[PDB]
């Protein structure tokens, strides 16, 4: 819902590890949230978006890499017809922890 | 937050560029890997670390256990531990990939 979520290497990734593509549907926004304990590593694959982490908003283009440490708030705004697609890795992942602002 | 590649580590057959050093949790690491033109990375296995590859640019015969893919941009891979991998760069282009290491408690790398 809101953005797609395409897990890879399911059951193959060590304890607390996780990897997946996500696809932020076009001209949609992902709302302010944070993770209690998990890290997000992004590699921006295609499209363009506004990406906030803590106190900084980036104009995320492909080939950018981002880190979201925990208790750090993030959002994306896609203002493009093309979907925003990113490679995600989650570190110290204890399952679902998204506290949604 | 954003990745600024300002640190190069040179291993001759290639170069490794770490990312977010100190920022990542224990057992984690992330880095770009540049396999310099016409070069190969020789057969090698990792004690326990896992290596997730996202292939950024170029083509290089990539070999994980028994399957040699031709790693193009957009491919994703995993090299579970105790798995023999290597890379032959074919082009006059760097073969570049975003790597994360999982279960990395320092250099578990070993080479055949
Ligand atoms: Zn997110
Ligand atoms: Zn390796
Ligand atoms: Zn694969």
**Nearest-angstrom CA–CA distance, A58 and B31:** 21
A37 interface with B at CB cutoff 8 Å: no
Nearest Cα to Cα of residue A65 among B17, B41, B89, B94: B17
Parallel, antiparallel or unpaired: strands B27-35 and B95-104: antiparallel
Break chain B down into helix, strand, coil percent, rounded to 5. 0, 55, 45
**Nearest-angstrom CA–CA distance, B68 and A17:** 25
Residues with CB under 5 A from ligand 3 (ion): B 77
The answer to whether A65 contacts B23, with C-beta atoms less than 8 Å apart, is no
In the sheet with A39-46, reading across from the earlier edge strand, the strands are A4-7, A18-24, A84-91, A39-46, A65-68
Nearest Cα to Cα of residue B13 among B45, B39, B43: B39
- The residues with which A96 forms a beta bridge, in sequence order, are none
Long-range CB pairs of A96-101, under 8 A, 24+ apart, other chains included: A97/A35, A97/A36, A97/A37, A97/A38, A97/A70, A98/A33, A98/A34, A98/A35, A99/A33, A99/A34, A99/A35, A99/A36, A100/A31, A100/A32, A100/A33, A101/A31, A101/A32, A101/A33, A101/A34, A101/A73
Q: What is the CATH number of domain B9-111?
A: 2.60.120.10
B30 interface with A at CB cutoff 8 Å: yes
**A17 close to A52: Cβ distance less than 8 angstroms:** no
| Backbone phi, psi, residue B8, to 5° | -110, 135
**A46 close to A61: Cβ distance less than 8 angstroms:** no
Four-CA torsion A87, B59, B36, A8, nearest 10 degrees: 30
Architecture of domain A3-100: Sandwich (2.60)
This PDB structure is determined at a resolution in Å of: 2.2
The structure was resolved experimentally with X-ray
Burial-class residue A71 by CB neighbours within 10 Å (0-12, 13-18, 19+): exposed
Query: Nearest ligand, CA of residue B16?
Result: 2
Per-residue tokens: B47: 């004690």
Longest dimension (CA), chain A: 37
Query: Nearest ligand, CA of residue B42?
Result: 2
């Amino acid at each position: 819902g809101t953005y797609r979520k395409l897990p890879l290497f399911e059951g193959e990734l060590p304890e607390g590890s996780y990897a997946q593509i996500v696809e932020v549907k076009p001209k949609q926004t992902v709302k302010k949230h944070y993770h209690e304990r998990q890290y997000e590593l992004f590699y921006i694959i295609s499209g363009e978006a506004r990406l906030g982490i803590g106190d900084t908003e980036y104009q995320a283009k492909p080939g950018d890499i981002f880190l979201v440490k925990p208790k750090t708030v993030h959002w994306v705004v896609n203002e493009k017809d093309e979907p925003f697609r990113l490679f995600v890795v989650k570190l110290n992942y204890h399952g679902d922890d998204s506290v949604w602002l």
